Structure formats: C-alpha cells, structure tokens
Amino acid sequence: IVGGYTCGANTVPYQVSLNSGYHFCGGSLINSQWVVSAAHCYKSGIQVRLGEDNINVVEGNEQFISASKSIVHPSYNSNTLNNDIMLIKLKSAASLNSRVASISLPTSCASAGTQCLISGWGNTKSSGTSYPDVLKCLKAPILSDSSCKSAYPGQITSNMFCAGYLEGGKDSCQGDSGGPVVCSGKLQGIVSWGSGCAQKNKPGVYTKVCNYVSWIKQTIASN
Template sequence: MTTAQCFFNDVREIVDPGSVMMFWKDKTGFDGWRATNLIPHPAYRLGSVHCNIGLAKTSGVFPSVYKNLGGHLEHDKPCEIFGYGSYDRGFRLPLYLQRMKVAPENRKTCNEVNESLICITFKNKEMPCNGDSGAPLICEGSVKGILSDGYVSREMCGIFRKSLTRYQILANYRLWLNEITGVFVESHYKSASYHHILIPLCLCFVFFNNIVKIH
C-alpha cells in the first residue's frame, strides 16, 4: 500500500517483503516480487490530497499480518514512521530503511483541509523529504496512516527548522480496502498477494533527515 500519486511516476515496481536494505538480493539473487497491478483509489485525482491512497498487487504470495485498523488516531500518542527517501540537502537516498519516532497532532490541525488527514509537525530540521510519499505511520503495532504530502522545501532537505506533513488515515478507507483485498481487516495471518506495508521507491515528495539507521 502506498499513495496513489506514486503510480503516476517512474517508480521501481518491486516489493521486497522484510528487507531493510535498498536493492537487497538474497543468496539466490531474489530481490522481491514484481508489482503486477497498480490500483489507485477511484476518487483520486493527480495533485489532490483527497483519497491519495493505492494498492499494488504482487507477482508472488507471502504471509502478512492484517490487524484491525481500529478507530481514529489519538493525538500525542507515540508512533513511528519509516521510509527510503532523501536524507540530506543533496537528495541522496539511504541504503538502509530509516525510521523516526513521532506524535500525531490534534486532528483539528488538518481537518480544515481534509477530514481524512492527520498532521505531524517536524522540528529541528528532522523531517520527511523527497521520496517518502506513501511511507507508513505505525502506532501501537498497526499501520494507521500513509504519508500523503507536506510543506517542505522542494530544493533541498533539512533547511527549515519546522515543517508540516499530512498523513492519510487508513481507517477512513476501510470499506475500499476490504473491497479490493478481502482480507485487510482480518485479525490473523493470511497468505495474500496484497501487502499492507509496501514502501516502493517513489520519488514523488517526502523522507527523513538525521534519523536512526536500521541494520
């Protein structure tokens, strides 16, 4: 799963489940499943934040945990974000998957724009940057949102001391996700060719600066 806007760009359409290293290959040369079908939300329009969500179907089947999406996010609760986007002012991409601890803000901050969004403010120049669109927001062990867009410099990463990013709240898309996958809100393991934590190399808009490296 990712943002629909990623499907309108020149993306590397490969899903590598469980890997924390970009372009990783195992001993047999396997480097991930090919994305065989890209499904943007039918109400999405390029350039809009409305319904900016999409699913990718893969060429292979692998086990995945599907947890109940629960209700809406509570602000100021600890969460984590992950991604493979640019991490410095030169727009270099990291070799390893990056993560950062965050706390979603009161929904009123974003509701004036779109009730399906939740905002996160980044300070001290640590913020998403180019390539992070579609990155997951994980709270209490479940994927609660995906990065839609943000207000950062398009020229370089980490030049603002404060920036605002907006995440699509997945609970708002429960019916559509169920319709497409048939298994998204199940509370047990299923083998499925749709994966709910897909982070493709989407060079659309957003990733992290000065954050923890996962080995």
C-alpha cells in the same frame, strides 16, 4: 526521513520498497498478497521488494515480487492529494516469517498525541539531498487537526492528518512517499505530502488510513 535513526535490518517487517529499476516509493504489506501505498506513487512496471534493509545490496532476506494489479482509490485527486491511497496486488503470495510480516489495519482512528513510527528510504536532508541505502525510522506524534489546518490553511481534508514536530528538523521526505505510519501496531497513515521537509511549521501530512478500511477490505475480497 530527516532527523531519524537507522531502524535496524528487518525491524520494520511490513515496510516495502517499490522498485521500477530503482527505489521510488515505500509501501506497507497488509497481507500475503497486498500492499498499501500512496496513489501519487502510481506507475506501471512496479516490482515490490520485501525483506529489504540495504536496497542496494542483496543481504539474504529479500523477496522480489512483481505487481499483478494496481488500484488507485476511486476518488483520488492528484491536485489536492485527497484520497492519496492505492492498493497493489502481488503476482504471488509473499512468504511470511519474522522479517517479512503484514501490519494490522486500524479498527479505529488514532488521535493527536499518539506516538507513531514512520519509516522509509527517502531523503535525509532538509536543505540538501542524501538518499540512504538502509531503512531509516522516526518516532513522531500525531498533531491536532487544528494545528494541522493552521499549518496548511485550506488544504487539510478529513482524509489527512499531520504528524511530526512544528519546530522542524524531524520529518519524512521525498522517497518516503507511500510508506508507513504505524501507531500502537496499526497502520494509521501513509506518507503523502508536506511543504519541503522538516521545515518549521510545515509538518508531514499523511493519508488517514482508518477512513479506507472498508474500501481496502472489500477491494481485497473481490480481486
């Protein structure tokens, strides 16, 4: 997150870190045994880390649970990042309390103007590299489809939306990928892509989760 703030320990209780020896992507806990992330975060050997604040220090609220199965969206295209979503099942159910909690799936899509909370352990600099140890947060609005398409001609599909600030300075970034965009208490987006980070007229591009609720539900029901 560039131009955000320190969230506060365990204030984003559905935020997970995906670890393969090191943090490499975010995710969102959507029930005791399943995480939603970005398909471009796919790899084998994932451990899901819940209850994290400082990802480099054991602080006492962590749960570390191996993935038993990963499911990349059937129509994921890695060249265009269309359908940039994947589900991860935990080998065991997480214990849910105030500091580790699921986030509700949307029943309807969000619209431009709605403010949302974006969170992660990604890069904090736009022209530089600094990775935080504690979870960072950014409040940002959803942008219009037309401004989104204007920023990124020929690249925005119906499974993507833009959020952030066209003036630059505030954005998600590398290492935030896969993590949440929560608006009015619903998971509306997944950190997916962007040209650099926090660049003028290059807002963040997010997977449009409301389009995938049917797929998420049926996948969970059968796996």
